[PDB]
């Protein structure tokens, strides 16, 4: 029989690393049906905040307005998604945006020629003033209660160095961007992960002994820290499977064609998660788990 | 279309979660059926995927001007050695996983970068 | 024309690395693979986005209808 208790006995997690952007960990004794659910929720269903509505007031630059709005929608914003609610689309445009669900960013930048530039200068930063527009130039314009709620943490891009646009003297950009909550299954700009995926733990079943110089070349067919030579007997053994990238270079030699079988542990998933910047990868994974549970609970409580 | 006369219309915008994903974590942006090749016989597209993967890995550009290789120095061998010396395999295949069921696919999948 | 904000395949923000890539190519005498690795681009999907960018915006900008030439 299968039971939640029998799953709780055998399931375990091995966090290999954890940063503010990337978290590498393991899920053991779980089914692909649930690991894939977690991965799909991380990529598509976990909400984040991105620029959606752009209100241009002037754009005399070479980049056209739709392209510039698309770029401004792509830049990730360091906003905690819980700090704002969801936009009610059915409401009219006047009352649709409010201080609890919309974040206003502005970008006003004019390019003027630098009258102190040296002769023979080819650097645009020395020839012109504001010849480059960066995501850091996206000022945050708090309105209403967010002037107090966001005082602890001002909204800035996760990558202020993103080169939004370039300018030349006389040219200018003046725009407002409205940032709301959305999910990545709608538009890829709301996806909060650079990439979240997994891979089964590789298995390297050595069938016959590889004693001798053959161990030197057999170990040469894998990533450096995967096969080792035993201190006692000159034998090859599997040190670390996680270090193996499955490239089957050993299979390309008929010497080992009947000495090793390459397989996988069909329940040992190595989740690698990277964050765009708005949330930590561990919190992304936690939110995906919670989303699956909450959607199941909504189905349970829905009348049939 | 590729630079090998492999024209085709876009039939669906496949969502990225439903796209197959590799052991590296990347999901291809173009899917071309393997059945486009056996009758068209555009092996240049295969070797271009191979060379493009090797070049994007080693940070180099490979030339493809005709009649630089021959039957003793095969581009398959050349770009396969370049791929093996980077951690990927000789034949350009990658272990991919189904994005709908999450299981690993039945065989290694031929991937690469083509223009 | 101008560097893309994100990588097409995975979605990693690569729009803040073009100027650094040029700096590491020019000031430091780094080859393209080394510069891409030192920028943090490991997947070839992310490497291609910077390795193959053309940067036509600079050539577009020379035709300025708002300044005397």
């Amino acid at each position: 029989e299968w039971n939640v208790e029998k799953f709780k006995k055998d399931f375990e997690v091995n966090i290999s690393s954890l940063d503010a952007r990337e978290a590498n960990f393991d899920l053991i004794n779980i089914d692909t049906s649930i690991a894939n659910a977690f991965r799909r929720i991380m990529i598509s269903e976990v909400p984040s905040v991105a620029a959606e509505y752009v209100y241009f007031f002037n754009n005399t630059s070479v980049i056209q307005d739709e392209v510039l709005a698309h770029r401004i929608g792509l830049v990730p914003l360091k906003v905690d998604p819980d700090m704002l609610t969801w936009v009610d689309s059915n409401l009219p445009d006047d009352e649709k945006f409010t201080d609890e669900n919309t974040i206003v960013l502005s970008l006003n930048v004019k390019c003027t020629r630098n009258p102190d530039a040296p002769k023979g200068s080819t650097d645009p930063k020395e020839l012109y003033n504001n010849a480059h527009v960066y995501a850091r130039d996206l000022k945050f314009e708090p309105q209403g209660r967010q002037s107090t709620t966001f005082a602890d943490c001002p909204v800035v891009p996760a990558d202020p160095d993103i080169l939004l646009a370039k300018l030349r003297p006389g040219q200018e950009i003046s725009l407002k961007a409205h940032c709301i909550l959305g999910i990545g299954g709608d538009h890829a700009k709301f996806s909060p992960v650079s990439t979240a995926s997994y891979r089964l733990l590789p298995q390297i079943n050595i069938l016959q002994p590889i004693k001798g110089e053959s161990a030197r070349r057999f170990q040469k067919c894998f990533p450096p820290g995967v096969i080792g030579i035993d201190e006692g007997s000159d034998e090859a053994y599997v040190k670390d499977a996680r270090k193996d990238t499955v490239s089957r270079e050993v299979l390309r030699y008929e010497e080992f064609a009947d000495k090793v079988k390459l397989g996988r542990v069909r329940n040992h998933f190595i989740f690698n998660v990277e964050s765009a910047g708005a949330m930590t990868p561990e919190e992304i994974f936690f939110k995906s788990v919670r989303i699956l549970k909450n959607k199941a609970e909504y189905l349970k409580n829905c009348p049939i | 279309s590729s630079r090998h006369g492999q024209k085709g219309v876009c039939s669906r915008k496949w969502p990225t979660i439903d796209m197959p994903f590799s052991e590296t974590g990347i999901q291809p942006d173009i899917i071309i059926n393997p059945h486009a090749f056996p009758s068209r016989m555009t092996i240049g597209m295969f070797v271009e995927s191979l060379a493009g993967k090797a070049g994007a890995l080693h940070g180099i550009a490979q030339d493809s001007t005709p009649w630089i290789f021959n039957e003793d120095d095969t581009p398959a061998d050349y770009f396969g050695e370049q791929l093996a010396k980077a951690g990927y395999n000789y034949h350009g295949n990658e272990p991919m996983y189904s994005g709908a069921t999450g299981e690993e696919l039945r065989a290694d999948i031929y991937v690469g970068v083509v223009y | 024309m101008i560097v893309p904000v994100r990588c097409f395949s995975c979605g990693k923000v690569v729009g803040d690395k073009w100027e650094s890539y040029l700096n590491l190519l020019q000031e430091d005498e780094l080859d393209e693979g080394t510069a891409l690795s030192r920028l943090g681009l490991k997947r070839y999907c992310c490497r291609r986005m910077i390795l193959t960018h053309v940067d036509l915006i600079e050539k577009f900008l020379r035709y300025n209808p708002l300044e005397k030439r």
Partner: peptide
């Protein structure tokens, strides 16, 4: 005929995720 010039300084670029 001289064979196609083998590029030099080819090192490992692919590593398993998290390493």
């Amino acid at each position: 005929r001289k064979d196609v010039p083998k590029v030099e300084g080819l090192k490992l670029e692919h590593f398993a995720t998290g390493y």
